[PDB]
Amino acid sequence: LDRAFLDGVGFTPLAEKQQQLQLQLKTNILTANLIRSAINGMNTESNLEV
């Protein structure tokens, strides 16, 4: 029933989230901050099932 009724999903794409993270975490590029590196490899192909 949930699958049949919950048709779409609402979320913000990755680009905006990365921009916000960059603005909030004002750090020079070329410094190897793993907080920024880890998120850069994400995606939301699977959001409906989750």
């Binding site: 990365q18 960059q22 590029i29 070329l30 850069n40």
Partner: peptide, 12 residues
């Protein structure tokens, strides 16, 4: 081969 060159992947 002699001069290593790296680049930023997707932060660009």
């Amino acid at each position: 081969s002699a001069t290593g060159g790296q680049a930023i992947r997707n932060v660009g």
